[PDB]
C-alpha cells in the first residue's frame, strides 16, 4: 500500500495544442491526473521544486518529458477523507530520455 | 417556582 | 488642502466627534423610540461641503 516509484511522463502529447498562457498550469493538472491514475488517490501534493522544474522555461517552454518520484503515504491527520495521499517530487537527471518505471525501497 | 420555596424557607430560618 | 483654515478644521473636528454610532445604554431606556443614528456620515457616501 505504502510504496514509492519512479515514473516518466510525456507532457508533449498532453499539452499538444494548448494555449501558451495555459500550458504550465495544464502540466500541473496533468501531473495530478497522472498520480491519481497510477496510485488511485485523489489528494496529490506536488513539491515546489517540481513546480520550479515545470516553470523553469516559463509558461510556454515546459520540458517534453519529466522524471518523477511518486510516493504514496499515510495521512497522519486527526481524521480526513483520503486516508492515503500521493506526494510527487522531481528527479534531476542527465536527461529523461530512455528510462522506465521502477519501484524504490 | 423554586425561588419561591427557598425564599420561604430562608424567611422561616431568619425570622427565628 | 493640508493648508486649511481654522474654520474648516473646526467644522472637521465637529464632524469627527459626530462620526459615531449610537450608545447601547439608550436602547435600554423607558419609552425609547431611537434605534439608530439617521444623521450618520461617511467621507465616501455624502460630502459635507
Amino acid at each position: 500500500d505504502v510504496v514509492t516509484r519512479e515514473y516518466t511522463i510525456n507532457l508533449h502529447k498532453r499539452l499538444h495544442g494548448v494555449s501558451f498562457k495555459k500550458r504550465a498550469p495544464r502540466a500541473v493538472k496533468e501531473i495530478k491526473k497522472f498520480a491519481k491514475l497510477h496510485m488511485g488517490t485523489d489528494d496529490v501534493r506536488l513539491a515546489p521544486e517540481l513546480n520550479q522544474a515545470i516553470w523553469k522555461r516559463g509558461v510556454k517552454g515546459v520540458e517534453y518529458r519529466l522524471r518523477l518520484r511518486i510516493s504514496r503515504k499515510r495521512n497522519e491527520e486527526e481524521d480526513a477523507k483520503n486516508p492515503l495521499f500521493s506526494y510527487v517530487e522531481p528527479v534531476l537527471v542527465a536527461s529523461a530520455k530512455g528510462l522506465q518505471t521502477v519501484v524504490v525501497e | 417556582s423554586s425561588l419561591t420555596l427557598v425564599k420561604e424557607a430562608l424567611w422561616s430560618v431568619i425570622d427565628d | 488642502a493640508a493648508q486649511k483654515s481654522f474654520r474648516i478644521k473646526q467644522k472637521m473636528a465637529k464632524a469627527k466627534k459626530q462620526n459615531r454610532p449610537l450608545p447601547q445604554w439608550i436602547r435600554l431606556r423607558t419609552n425609547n423610540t431611537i434605534r439608530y443614528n439617521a444623521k450618520r456620515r461617511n467621507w465616501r457616501r455624502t460630502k459635507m461641503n
Binding site: - | - | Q24, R27, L28, R40, R45
Partner: protein, 95 residues
C-alpha cells in the same frame, strides 16, 4: 553536536509549570481595547446580560437596512422616481 545539544536542553522554570497549560487571565474584551481606552459603546452598560440584550436589539433593527443593501448606517442615497433625460433627425442628447 553533542556539546551543543547538552548546552541546549532546559531547566523547566516555575513560570512554565504554572502558566504553560493555563491561559485566559484577563480574558478577551469585546472591542480589543486596553485597560484605559474609553470604549463608548459599553462604558455606560456595566453587565454582560444587558450588553447582550443591547447587541441583540441592534442586530434585530439592522435587518431592514441590510435587506436594502446599504453600506452601513450612513448610506442614504435617495433615488428619484423618474429622470427627465431618459425619455426625450438632428442633434440627439445621447449616442
Amino acid at each position: 553536536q553533542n556539546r551543543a545539544a547538552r548546552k541546549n536542553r532546559y531547566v523547566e522554570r516555575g513560570s512554565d509549570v504554572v502558566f504553560g497549560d493555563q491561559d485566559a487571565l484577563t480574558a478577551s474584551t469585546e472591542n480589543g481595547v486596553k485597560l484605559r481606552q474609553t470604549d463608548r459603546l459599553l462604558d455606560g452598560v456595566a453587565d454582560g446580560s444587558m450588553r447582550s440584550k443591547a447587541d441583540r436589539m441592534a442586530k434585530m433593527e439592522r435587518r431592514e437596512r441590510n435587506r436594502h443593501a446599504k453600506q452601513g448606517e450612513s448610506d442614504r442615497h435617495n433615488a428619484v422616481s423618474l429622470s427627465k433625460h431618459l425619455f426625450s433627425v438632428g442633434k440627439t442628447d445621447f449616442r
